[PDB]
Design a protein around this ligand. Sequence first.
Ligand SMILES: *[C@@H]1O[C@H](CO)[C@@H](O[C@@H]2O[C@H](CO)[C@@H](O)[C@H](O)[C@H]2NC(C)=O)[C@H](O)[C@H]1NC(C)=O
Ligand SMILES: *[C@@H]1O[C@H](CO)[C@@H](O[C@@H]2O[C@H](CO)[C@@H](O)[C@H](O)[C@H]2NC(C)=O)[C@H](O)[C@H]1NC(C)=O
Ligand SMILES: *[C@@H]1O[C@H](CO)[C@@H](O)[C@H](O)[C@H]1NC(C)=O
Ligand SMILES: *[C@@H]1O[C@H](CO)[C@@H](O)[C@H](O)[C@H]1NC(C)=O
Ligand SMILES: *[C@@H]1O[C@H](CO)[C@@H](O)[C@H](O)[C@H]1NC(C)=O
Lengths: 160, 321
Amino acid sequence: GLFGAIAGFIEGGWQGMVDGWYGYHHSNEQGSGYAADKESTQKAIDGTTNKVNSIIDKMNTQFEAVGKEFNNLERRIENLNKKMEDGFLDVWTYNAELLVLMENERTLDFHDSNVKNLYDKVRLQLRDNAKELGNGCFEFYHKCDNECMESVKNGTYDYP
Amino acid sequence: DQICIGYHANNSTEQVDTIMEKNVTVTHAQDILEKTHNGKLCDLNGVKPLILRDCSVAGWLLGNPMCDEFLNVPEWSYIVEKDNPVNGLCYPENFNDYEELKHLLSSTNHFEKIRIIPRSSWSNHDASSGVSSACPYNGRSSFFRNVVWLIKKNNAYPTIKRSYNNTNQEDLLILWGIHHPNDAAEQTKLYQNPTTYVSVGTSTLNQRSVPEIATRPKVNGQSGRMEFFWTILKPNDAINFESNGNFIAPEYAYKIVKKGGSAIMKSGLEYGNCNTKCQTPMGAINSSMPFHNIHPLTIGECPKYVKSGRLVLATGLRNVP
Ligand SMILES: *[C@@H]1O[C@H](CO)[C@@H](O[C@@H]2O[C@H](CO)[C@@H](O)[C@H](O)[C@H]2NC(C)=O)[C@H](O)[C@H]1NC(C)=O
Ligand SMILES: *[C@@H]1O[C@H](CO)[C@@H](O[C@@H]2O[C@H](CO)[C@@H](O)[C@H](O)[C@H]2NC(C)=O)[C@H](O)[C@H]1NC(C)=O
Ligand SMILES: *[C@@H]1O[C@H](CO)[C@@H](O)[C@H](O)[C@H]1NC(C)=O
Ligand SMILES: *[C@@H]1O[C@H](CO)[C@@H](O)[C@H](O)[C@H]1NC(C)=O
Ligand SMILES: *[C@@H]1O[C@H](CO)[C@@H](O)[C@H](O)[C@H]1NC(C)=O
């Protein structure tokens, strides 16, 4: 995708993470599991919700056809009327379809970027304490447990 | 021991399009296009439309005998007329500036009928024999009910001089006409005087019509024709009519109520005994969607019309197995 994460260096999605759009999957002595990251997910949710709302609101002044009639000796103005109403209908149809196509692309890249930025945030944390497998996972050198795992997600993780 | 960053996935089958790729399956999407309607003509916010059925606007306003259903219609939300109503001008002819009158209607919600000139008021003219087989009623010759086809009396047609002052608060729509006979012989038989006219004047209207006596093809059995006119008489203004023949005089006129905000919709449907906030000539719409592709001529609070067959926004991410 533009940011290379989704369907990229992180090959597939997790059917097992139903808690949100982006998250983690740990693995240690105590066990394993998925845990959606509520911060980035909600941040994504607010962004998309505003986007949908903006699109709608921008499409509130579109043209509105009005019925009129013309007699047999008013064919030129009747055609002018017709071309004009169809004209605006085609313009607004174009605006709606194009806006949706363009924003859909941006929405997909937006999720891609959120994943990439979450990954990079973690990578920065696990400075030298973990090994980058290059598949979206980090393998710690010296074992790490549930409290330790929670530390990363806690964003609190730091030797300090 | 590992910690992995990842993204959601589900069994979603929903698809969206982008510039570079079509049909991208995504975890979540939002359809924003209404594609359904209820196939009926409903009341708009509790107010029923004026459904003209087989009558045209002209048949209604002039009072074609086949249109008695509309002699005194109540307030309406919108008006529905068929493409080619069979009952319009029963006695054949022309209606001046007809489309402008229809447009005027489209901005009003009520025409309250009032009698401005009693039919019994014609003491020196015959106000009963002006009927035709072209406008039958109960098996006999009749005529538009809202106007009067005046005929000579005792072999004379003394010049008519009538005035009407609009003492109402509303603008008044007044209709009248003139008869164009098939030949001189008919001119004499109905009106006696051979050279006639119908002159009309208000503060703004100035008009004098002369009968064009000729022979044309029969329409509804008539080779003669009627030509109708209309004007809006403002409150406190007066209309003056003068004619020595061929006059189709007003009996009833209409007070105009601009509660304004109507539409003349073309449709073959009849009333559906339902209520809606958005009506199209094909049926009503009830939806939260921002767009619809039902029909472009709608009335009421509606979604925005577009020709699209599909409009779906991506909300979630690419759905990767
Ligand atoms: C969440 O962050 C805290 C630091 O703010 C981490 O530290 C532990 O927090 C728990 C309470 O949740 C305390 O009982 C522990 O004593 C703290 N660590 C120690 C041993 O001092 C915490 O690990 C992070 N995640 C969680 C909830 O475990
Ligand atoms: C229609 O009738 C009205 C009411 O009689 C006329 O208006 C009044 O005319 C008198 C006499 O000039 C004035 O003193 C009043 O002030 C008028 N009243 C109003 C309501 O304005 C009116 O002139 C007649 N209309 C026409 C064109 O003849
Ligand atoms: C899986 O997909 C089916 C078909 O759309 C759906 O009915 C079902 O609810 C989905 N499973 C879940 C998440 O409940
Ligand atoms: C997109 O998918 C739909 C599935 O119903 C299909 O009908 C359509 O032809 C597809 N378009 C492309 C890009 O082939
Ligand atoms: C539209 O549908 C909703 C959901 O049933 C309902 O509450 C509302 O009354 C309907 N509106 C009309 C006018 O049909």
